[PDB]
């Protein structure tokens, strides 16, 4: 969906400009049911950095 594009831009805009802060982008399927929030946060806390 083209209207999502500012989210991918803003993610990379953080990665190079506040480089001490950890962050991640997760892209969901837009039509399947969304997963349990503990699955999302769980796999994200395994990344140091970005």
């Amino acid at each position: 969906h083209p209207a999502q594009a500012p989210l991918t831009a803003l993610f990379t805009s953080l990665v190079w400009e506040h480089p001490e802060l950890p962050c991640a982008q997760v892209d969901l399927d837009p039509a399947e049911d969304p997963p349990t929030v503990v699955s999302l946060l769980g796999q994200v806390m395994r990344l140091p950095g970005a």
């Binding site: 503990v38 946060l41 769980g42 796999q43 806390m45």
Partner: protein, 50 residues
């Protein structure tokens, strides 16, 4: 290129009671649902809306 995490793809634990998680969404029902889910797992959370 997208690589599947078929190797080691298991979530692991959330990092203990160091502080709250803030959830903001376009949908109040989604924000509330994830705040209920984090409560079941003993993680403190706050719901935010526009």
């Amino acid at each position: 290129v997208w690589h599947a995490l078929a190797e080691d793809g298991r979530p692991g634990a959330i990092g203990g009671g160091t502080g709250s998680w803030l959830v903001f969404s376009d949908d109040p029902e989604r924000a509330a649902a994830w705040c209920d889910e984090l409560a079941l797992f003993g993680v403190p959370a706050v719901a935010l809306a526009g």
